[PDB]
Amino acid sequence: DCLGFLWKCNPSNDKCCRPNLVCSRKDKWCKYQI
């Protein structure tokens, strides 16, 4: 599994399900790529 959405991401340790969910530089968390 991965880090879900609303979970703070780490650019260097991105363990989010990309590209569906992705670390947001804007939101600072992994969010959906809306």
Curated annotation (Swiss-Prot):
<feature type="disulfide bond">
    <location>
        <begin position="2"/>
        <end position="17"/>
    </location>
</feature>
<keyword id="KW-0800">Toxin</keyword>
<protein>
    <recommendedName>
        <fullName>Beta-theraphotoxin-Ps1a</fullName>
    </recommendedName>
</protein>
<comment type="function">
    <text>Potent inhibitor of Nav1.2/SCN2A voltage-gated sodium channels (IC(50)=0.6-0.7 nM). Also weakly inhibits Nav1.1/SCN1A, Nav1.4/SCN4A, Nav1.5/SCN5A, Nav1.7/SCN9A and Nav1.8/SCN10A (IC(50)=20-610 nM). It acts by shifting the voltage dependence of channel activation to more depolarized potentials and by blocking the inward component of the sodium current. It shows low affinity for lipid bilayers. In vivo, this toxin causes general ataxia, lack of response to stimuli, and semiparalysis. After a few minutes, the mice are unable to stand, and breathing is reduced in rhythm and intensity.</text>
</comment>
<dbReference type="GO" id="GO:0019871">
    <property type="term" value="F:sodium channel inhibitor activity"/>
</dbReference>
<feature type="disulfide bond">
    <location>
        <begin position="16"/>
        <end position="30"/>
    </location>
</feature>
<keyword id="KW-0960">Knottin</keyword>
<keyword id="KW-1015">Disulfide bond</keyword>
<dbReference type="GO" id="GO:0044493">
    <property type="term" value="P:envenomation resulting in negative regulation of voltage-gated sodium channel activity in another organism"/>
</dbReference>
<dbReference type="Pfam" id="PF07740">
    <property type="entry name" value="Toxin_12"/>
</dbReference>
<dbReference type="GO" id="GO:0005615">
    <property type="term" value="C:extracellular space"/>
</dbReference>
<dbReference type="GO" id="GO:0090729">
    <property type="term" value="F:toxin activity"/>
</dbReference>
<dbReference type="InterPro" id="IPR011696">
    <property type="entry name" value="Huwentoxin-1"/>
</dbReference>
<comment type="similarity">
    <text>Belongs to the neurotoxin 10 (Hwtx-1) family. 08 (Gtx1-15) subfamily.</text>
</comment>
<keyword id="KW-0964">Secreted</keyword>
<feature type="disulfide bond">
    <location>
        <begin position="9"/>
        <end position="23"/>
    </location>
</feature>
<keyword id="KW-0738">Voltage-gated sodium channel impairing toxin</keyword>
<keyword id="KW-0528">Neurotoxin</keyword>
<keyword id="KW-0872">Ion channel impairing toxin</keyword>
<dbReference type="InterPro" id="IPR013140">
    <property type="entry name" value="Huwentoxin_CS1"/>
</dbReference>
